[PDB]
Amino acid sequence: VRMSVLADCLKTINNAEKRGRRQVLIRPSSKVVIKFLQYMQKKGYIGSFEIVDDHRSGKIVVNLLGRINKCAVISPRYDVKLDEIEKIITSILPSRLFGHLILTTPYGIMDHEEARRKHTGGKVLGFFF
Amino acid sequence: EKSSKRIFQGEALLRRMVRQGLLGENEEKLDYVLGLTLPKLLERRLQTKVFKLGLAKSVHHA
Amino acid sequence: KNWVPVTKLGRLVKEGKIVSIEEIYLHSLPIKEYQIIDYFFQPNECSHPLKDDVVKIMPVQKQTRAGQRTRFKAFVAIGDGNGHCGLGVKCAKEVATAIRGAIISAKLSLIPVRRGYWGNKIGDPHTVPMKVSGKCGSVRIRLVPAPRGTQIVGAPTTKKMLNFAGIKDCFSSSCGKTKTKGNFLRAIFNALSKTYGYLTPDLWKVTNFDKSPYEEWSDFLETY
Amino acid sequence: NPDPVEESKKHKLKRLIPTPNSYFMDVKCPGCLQITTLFSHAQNVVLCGSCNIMLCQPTGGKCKLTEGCSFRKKIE
Amino acid sequence: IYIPRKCSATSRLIPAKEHGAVQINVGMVDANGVYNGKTETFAISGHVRQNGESDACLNRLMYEKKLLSFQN
Amino acid sequence: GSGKPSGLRAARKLRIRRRTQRWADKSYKKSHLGTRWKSNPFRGSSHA
Amino acid sequence: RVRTKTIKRAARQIVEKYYAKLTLDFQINKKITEEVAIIPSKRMKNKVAGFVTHLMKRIQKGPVRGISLKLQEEERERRLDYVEPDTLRMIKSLG
Amino acid sequence: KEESIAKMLICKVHIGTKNLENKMKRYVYTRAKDGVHIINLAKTYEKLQLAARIIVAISNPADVVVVSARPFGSRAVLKFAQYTGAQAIAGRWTPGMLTNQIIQKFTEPRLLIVTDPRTDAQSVKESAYANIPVIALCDSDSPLEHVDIAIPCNNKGKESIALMYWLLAQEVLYLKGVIPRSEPWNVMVDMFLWR
RNA sequence: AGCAUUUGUCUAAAAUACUUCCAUUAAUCAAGAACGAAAGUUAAGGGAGUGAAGACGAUCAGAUACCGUCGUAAUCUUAACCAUAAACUAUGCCGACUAGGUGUUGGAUGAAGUGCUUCCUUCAGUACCUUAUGAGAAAUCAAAGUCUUUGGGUUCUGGGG
RNA sequence: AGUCUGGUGCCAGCAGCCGCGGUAAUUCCAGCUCCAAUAGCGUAUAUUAAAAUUGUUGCAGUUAAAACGCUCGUAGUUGA
């Protein structure tokens, strides 16, 4: 069975981007996926997407820019302190300067830069670059 | 940046470098602290300073 | 020095229509004549030398009814000290010949590395601008960016090769049989080679195309 | 480009959007001529109303009616 | 530092030593249907060519620039 | 797939598997087992 | 028995520079080779002349797989000088 | 205008062989019940014109190579070589030719025109090692490995090959200064066919 | 594990089709359990052929062997046990994603040979060929891929000889 | 950092390891020279790194060590 929706979605996108497909259909839509794509969109690492409805969870069709080098989901949903963030980013991201490590916080889902500015730790969701 | 501990400690360390004579006046940023280099530090030995200023005629003489 | 060119690209470089090695890199052309590389980086009246070094000479034997048949394989490293490394391999019957051939191969291989920095604009480039990994055989080598508060934290071999490329400060790691020297060198070379392939924010934006040298100097080739 | 591909109708049940390939049919019996509601893919025997004479024979496909009868689609 | 080409079809960076990548120059006409001087240029990565998808990608690219009529 | 458990509460399985599997190693066995103090002629003294 | 590369190669070179003089007699060909070639041995000159004669004899049954020739250029001059149902439906569809 | 389409049409170039192949599916019109594939044609004509523009856009035409290795196509390519500035290489391919710098026969061209990708496959592969894009007369059985502009055509019929080359030549000549688009070209279609 | 004569009876099974019902009931699972080739054991039948043992005749320097002739036990049914096998795709199981073509066994949908037959489209089994700017230590692998750009879930296992 | 000089001659010995020593020993025993660290420098035993060879991060299990014979299933872990 699927378990976490999000991991399948990024894995699917990532394959399409590595392959050079230009557009791709993510099968099991959810609230979290919408937030993730929208967050990615805000910081310009993916294009416009159409969520097409159903009556059983929708589907989403996402326009690729030919720009994502790697996107994946961190699992299980590890807890992480505001203090710990630097050590996480150093470990995962391909550079300190660029790419994004994405969290779920009481103030919403955002990347680390935002979290640092805010305050609040949370659970780590995934990352892209 | 703007972190209270960071501004305080960084400035303090840098001021200590200025006292030592490791960093010039124009530089005042932590990447010039990283830029510090082993001849630059040796250049601040008292024997070196004497040899430069005179008195002796050799480093060994100094 | 002043050879007769075999092919069109070479002919253009001899004459001086082609400005510098960047232009041929830009259009990803096959730099077949060693003379082309040699002309751009000729050691006097130019910015920086190309420095050679024989990193490893290893004996290999075919084995025959009569006996051994000993060849000498040679791994050689070439580097400008300012953005260009080259990894050269030649296997030949005798030692001096093998080295000479290897230096030719090394010049042919020559690749430009992308250089960047850990933090800020207030240094010129000094480190590998993002994590890059190159694998060959068993051995996988990863270059990972470090502040200027560092040297090259690596194997002797990695330190030498990366220094040759003109990348001052890095953190390195490795997994597998590093002792298999040639494979380790090739892996390092691939890792360096990957550096300008990456695509990063500095390169997100669209831009125009220069004309290919084959089209820009079409007339000058057509006349011969 | 899989957002709006029109000629995808030929694909298996489970396409971009679910759609049944099954419909209801307005049928009438030859020589008795009363209207009847009926299901393409009916799973049990189907009678005409006035005198129970079979209409459709069920079988595991689309179901095979009888040789007679005339059929409108009963979609709105 | 130099700026490497980015692919017209895939929007992706063309490697330094690739050789599989190409620049195709497509000539404009004058009004009579005779060859102008000027050229609309496309850069095609080795990667799509190696796969063999190059014609399909090229067709969509031509449609986007408004040269080939039919699209796909 | 990954073969090791991963879960947020799976710490027990990770500890139990590691604790048993530690006994595979040659060096570890030499350090932690009682045979040491018996069969070693110097009884683990450096000198005699 | 046959003829080696040195012999065949020479045989091809002669004809290449002297086709017009060369002819369908062995003695005349041998005279031509003696004039033209730099070969130092009698036996070798004869061997070359024999094979050039054999190639010359071979031609006039189409190309000899070597040597540019005027005869070919002339030969080249001599050489130079409703429908199915668905296919109709396609033509109709196109317009 | 129509006339090119009609001239092509009468020749059997629309009859592709069996064995559809995925990538060519968009250029097939329909499989005839017989087991041969009819080829759209109209798309071929537009494509052919595109190809003509790319051939014309090369300022030195000597750097434009035609290649084939089938006797019945040989005549067509040699004639094509005479009329446009393009050099043909016909007969057996020399299989070091593009990669090898120091070989005598050599040639480093700027563009390649290939007659059948399955047939001339080493030459096609060699082209990819030194950045040549390859326009391609492509058919039912063709792979499209390293071919950029694909021109749908029956590659197997001698008349078909001749007709195809003849139209290509006429377009390049029209684009060039040679002939205004009002006039039919002088050279017979018959001139490019095998004997 | 294994299963090939005929028909009957009792049973299960999977796929398909389904504008049929239930509404998270699930996934993998230490513990424990069911089944578990072949040989072997215990007991009754049964006993043709085959045939460890054994007996001879040969072959060989020698032959307790290969080869030959004969030949108990076992092989077969019933009723218990045994619990292992290179019990082998040497590939844990569930889940998503990737790339073509050639087939094939089982359904269902449309169209075209003489209601039936065929072909098309499509599911589910299931192999093969080519292809991997995928992977691998290579052999090779459409999974051994989507991996230092390392984290979809999980059981079990290994750590020089 | 020594294809330097003598003695020994498979012996004596050295040698963590690979190996060296059977009459030119670049390894022994000396002498000479050279080299590393230096008022400190060797040796032993334990211990950490090196070890992503204990692996959460972060291993391997077709063939190198390693998928339970097969399935059901309770605890466990995981759950649109």
Side-chain angles (χ1 to χ4, degrees), chain B residues 6-54:
Chain B
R6 205 291 195 112
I7 63 173
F8 168 76
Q9 193 175 6
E11 186 171 291
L13 182 61
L14 196 132
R15 173 271 191 166
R16 202 180 300 131
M17 302 298 99
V18 174
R19 205 178 187 200
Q20 282 290 142
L22 283 164
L23 293 180
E25 292 68 53
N26 308 114
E27 43 281 280
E28 56 178 297
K29 305 180 182 180
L30 304 184
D31 284 297
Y32 288 90
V33 188
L34 296 171
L36 293 174
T37 184
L38 190 63
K40 191 59 183 179
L41 184 53
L42 295 173
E43 185 179 288
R44 307 301 297 171
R45 291 183 70 137
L46 180 65
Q47 59 180 114
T48 310
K49 189 67 192 187
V50 171
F51 184 50
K52 297 299 184 181
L53 182 59

Side-chain angles (χ1 to χ4, degrees), chain D residues 64-75:
Chain D
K64 292 181 69 176
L65 305 174
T66 175
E67 56 79 56
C69 304
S70 186
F71 12 77
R72 302 177 289 215
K73 296 191 295 185
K74 204 160 192 163
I75 53 173

Side-chain angles (χ1 to χ4, degrees), chain F residues 4 7-10 14 18 21 24-25 30-31 44 46-47:
Chain F
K4 295 191 295 182
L8 203 60
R9 309 178 191 76
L14 294 173
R18 183 50 37 61
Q21 289 303 314
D25 180 57
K30 182 181 172 291
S31 67
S46 60
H47 290 80

Side-chain angles (χ1 to χ4, degrees), chain H:
Chain H
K1 178 181 69 178
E2 184 180 291
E3 302 76 10
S4 40
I5 310 176
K7 194 59 178 178
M8 178 172 54
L9 184 60
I10 296 169
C11 184
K12 299 180 68 177
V13 332
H14 55 95
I15 306 295
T17 193
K18 215 162 184 181
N19 316 113
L20 179 60
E21 193 291 309
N22 195 335
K23 301 189 172 65
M24 287 299 284
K25 191 170 183 180
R26 57 207 166 95
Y27 292 120
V28 169
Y29 184 83
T30 191
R31 183 183 295 148
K33 174 263 184 180
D34 306 77
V36 286
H37 297 83
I38 310 179
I39 306 177
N40 180 280
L41 300 181
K43 292 179 182 179
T44 298
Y45 185 58
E46 289 289 290
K47 225 73 183 302
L48 197 65
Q49 189 279 149
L50 185 70
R53 292 175 172 226
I54 77 90
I55 293 168
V56 174
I58 302 300
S59 58
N60 181 14
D63 295 326
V64 179
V65 176
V66 204
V67 79
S68 190
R70 301 313 312 136
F72 43 80
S74 190
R75 176 57 177 277
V77 300
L78 292 169
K79 294 294 102 187
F80 189 90
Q82 174 185 5
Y83 282 97
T84 185
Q87 196 273 1
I89 295 177
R92 174 172 174 72
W93 182 240
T94 296
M97 176 164 274
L98 297 176
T99 50
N100 197 333
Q101 60 186 307
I102 212 69
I103 187 173
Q104 186 180 357
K105 301 183 190 299
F106 196 21
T107 310
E108 182 171 299
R110 290 188 65 208
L111 180 63
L112 239 303
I113 310 181
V114 183
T115 303
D116 179 276
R118 181 73 67 163
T119 307
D120 293 299
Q122 296 218 118
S123 200
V124 187
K125 193 59 168 182
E126 254 61 86
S127 301
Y129 275 52
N131 59 262
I132 311 298
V134 185
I135 62 173
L137 307 181
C138 64
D139 200 346
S140 303
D141 63 302
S142 301
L144 299 181
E145 184 179 0
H146 308 294
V147 311
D148 274 3
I149 307 176
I151 308 301
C153 182
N154 176 289
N155 292 348
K156 309 302 191 283
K158 61 166 174 287
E159 61 170 68
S160 303
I161 288 297
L163 205 309
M164 192 50 59
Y165 275 111
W166 194 90
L167 285 175
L168 185 57
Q170 196 179 237
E171 273 296 307
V172 298
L173 297 166
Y174 285 142
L175 290 166
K176 294 172 178 291
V178 180
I179 174 172
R181 285 183 171 274
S182 301
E183 295 186 292
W185 185 36
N186 303 101
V187 183
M188 291 186 171
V189 173
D190 310 70
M191 186 54 69
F192 275 57
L193 189 59
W194 194 76
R195 266 84 188 88

Side-chain angles (χ1 to χ4, degrees), chain C residues 25 85-88 104-111 186 189, chain E residues 17:
Chain C
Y25 286 143
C85 55
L87 187 280
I104 293 175
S105 293
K107 287 183 177 173
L108 295 171
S109 297
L110 201 78
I111 269 171
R186 189 68 181 181
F189 190 69
Chain E
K17 195 56 172 59

